[model samples]
Target: ITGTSTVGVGRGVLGDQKNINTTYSTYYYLQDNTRGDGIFTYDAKYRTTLPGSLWADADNQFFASYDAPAVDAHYYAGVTYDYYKNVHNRLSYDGNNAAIRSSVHYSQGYNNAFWNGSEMVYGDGDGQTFIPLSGGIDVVAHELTHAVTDYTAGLIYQNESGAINEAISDIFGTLVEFYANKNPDWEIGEDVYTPGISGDSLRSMSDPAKYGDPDHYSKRYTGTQDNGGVHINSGIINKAAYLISQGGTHYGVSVVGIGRDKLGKIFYRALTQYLTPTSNFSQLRAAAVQSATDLYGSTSQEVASVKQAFDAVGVK
Candidate 1:
């Protein structure tokens, strides 16, 4: 809908007050025109239908309980957009400044969020397992990075490729979290994962096995569930990425920390230039090694650390 651009004050799911971009044409609509083509957020109204309706408020203020998820979804989408543009020099998820859209309050007790190949969708969890997922910046970035992957590597979302795809999302998600400078950590979805629990997350990059995920290639799940354990087996790659960034010892191998910026440069280069749809763990190792070499020369410690990180994770 066409309208005059405006700003609205809102409280997010976590009860944090923030300003959100809106459009005014009688009712204030959650259509931000400031970034890219635009950032549009919708109300799912606890139904299965997508992008149900453009979220509109009569007074240009969003403080109601129902408005919480929409606030975060809209606000955090902008944050993720900024992260891509500022940190990686990529314009939006497609590098074309495409419109970023999201829907909140998807269904009754829906426990997950996804990109769905088009727009972002967030589930209002059953209060026990999760809060509105948009409250977690890492979760938001994780889903949006799927769009980035689709446009770039186009990695097949099954078996080893699927695991690689998931790890890429986790890696970038954590990077975006750090970029935001909001209590940054290597944990994913800790902010909104469980209301009843404390100090827990959906997954841990620093220690994937903390949540029973395999940190080593030999321990990877081979089951057919979860699209060939896409989420389950991504731990191997996640650990490798963590080791690359922060430095760690695994089994008998030790990796010298190359820091976060270098880690992101290497992985971003690999994702955009070297990785393919069918790239597996071994191929991912090759891509990262080549990526590090490309950015820092063949003899650089960055390249050596990339090799050591994969070796620590038993990828090669």
Candidate 2:
């Protein structure tokens, strides 16, 4: 809803204190207006219906017992917007100033979050598998990146294309976490996944095999589950992306680290220009090579590193 812009202080799901943008009209609503229409957060009230209601507050302060989820939802959305605009020079998820929306408290004891092709949805965990999903910056970025992928290559969410979509989300999500510089790592959903486990994450880019995900093309899954093993097979591509950014060795193969900035630039170019809705792993290898060539020439070290990284993961 439209209203006067104001600032509200609140504590997030992890008890992290920060200020958030809010809309005011007698009561404060969790709506940011700094980045276009800004980020609008809502409460699900533990129901299945999406985007239950706009989070309402009596004052411009949100540090209460029940406002934790909304706090992070709003703040994280802003950071995600800043991430894309600052790094890729792209506007919101659609490359236009789209209104970013998120719904919290979705279902009782919920434990997952997603883009749903329109807005972000988060489930407050049962306090075991995860906490509020929005508490994890990487998780928030992951869902947002899904929207980005949809608008770009429109990669189908099944088989090879689906896996590529998942890996891209993980790749950019990690970059956004590092962009924020808060306990950043290649682990996805570590901050909010499995609270009892100290160092475990939903997935690992540096070592996808740690979570039973294949790091090599030979180990790729061909199952019909998980939309043709999209989540599982994505480990292969994730491994390749990690190696490209940080450099590593696996199965007697080695890669040279080219840092995150160049890695992102190459991948972004590929997604925007070279990939298609039905692209497969082999096609991805070609796209990355072509993307690297476009950015750094065919003979540059960047192109070599991209090639070696895919070869390390047996993509070729």
Candidate 3:
């Protein structure tokens, strides 16, 4: 997979022995169903009886009939591919013409979806609570962005690094959803869970306080669960990005606005080009500000907003 080649992996080496072997050996999973047909061994599983199941089964069955992703997955993937290509000039996940592979029906009655360090795997809902994971473009993009994080910052999935990792995914996931210009409903995983549920998402970028959550960060918010509550505490950073992009206050304090496109470009640049694996919140803030200054001017509003947003998020 690492050999020098002219045509590249997706075009030439994907089906070739080297790349296939590399992908298989690296991230592929094999399971025996001897111990109950539906129990998961390595990855986490959510019973659809739960109020907010992550993966939906019916949607997976529908996509399986179509022989590929259903309309929504294809639409979102195309939108995401185009977003990275046109907006950031990135060719694909690897920036080297890497072919995107998505699996819609992964496990039976499985509640969660994740990127297994390579391909995206989704589970069918248990039919009692959730639907299919692919029902939402944001979830799809969230899983895919994990690949991006792995290729770029390689953030250690623990502590603040893990929070930043999750936040980065949520940041781009929401951006991709908006980039597609889909319905403006501001909840994550709303499509996956049953409609009658009270709170449909694990976190909310637009309004973090809606889930009895705080809008800002505090010392007590550092560690709890979900990999040090990376996905949950990440709300602070996610909301910061949203507020920064929208030019709103950290907590109703007026701040300058950086347009969506400019803010996305700055963060994308910082994540891919500047930040390192061990970078914490302070480091990410500095890198984003530096990225803004480099793309715009040092005195540009873009840089100022980027800095202010970090400050608002308690990262200064």
Task: Rate residue 114 of model 3 by lDDT.
Answer: 78
| lDDT of candidates 1 onward, in order | 0.94, 0.92, 0.62
Which candidate comes out best when scored by lDDT?
A: 1
Runs with alpha carbons beyond 4 Å of true place in candidate 2: none
Using TM-score as the measure, what is the rank order of every candidate, best first? 1, 2, 3
Tens digits of per-residue lDDT for model 1, 61-178: 9999999999999999999999889888999989999999999999899999999999999999999999999999999999999999999999999999999999999999999899
Clashes (candidate 1): 0
TM-score versus the correct structure, for each prediction: 0.99, 0.98, 0.75
Runs off by more than 4 Å, candidate 1: none
Query: RMSD for each model, in Å, please?
Result: 0.8, 0.9, 10.6
Model 3 regions lying over 4 Å from their true place: 1-71, 198-200, 212-214
lDDT of 2 by residue, 50-137 (tens): 8799999997787776788889989998988998999999999888899999999999998899999889999999999999999999
